[PDB]
Amino acid sequence: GSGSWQSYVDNQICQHVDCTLAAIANIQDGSIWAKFEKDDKKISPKELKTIADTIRQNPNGFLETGIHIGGEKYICIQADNQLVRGRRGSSALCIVATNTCLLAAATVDGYPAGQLNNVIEKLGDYLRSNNY
């Protein structure tokens, strides 16, 4: 109980990753808690509902369907209960699931994917360690 989820998105993710898209949501509903959208991108609550339910119930599904966020399709490169990574051209996507939260961000074309992965996975590890 300090600060807000928008601080996390605006400070912990967007200040360390050059993002087209970032979101934190409820892992159970998909209810969006904070977000960032660049230019003409938008995160449907339905995109996140399905993402949230797929990562928790059947993460292998992303390998079949791909990943749908910001109104665009990303190719899945790996998927499990806690971590899903994706590609769309020169843009990377990293999605993490904690005990209560879903984190997601995607990168401006050409931005290093390891840096996004590190930022999202380490923030997820911090939250998970706090039982969030």
Partner: peptide
């Protein structure tokens, strides 16, 4: 609606 459940203090 209510605020969502509050985040923990930011990481280092």
């Amino acid at each position: 609606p209510p605020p969502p459940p509050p985040p923990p203090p930011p990481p280092p």
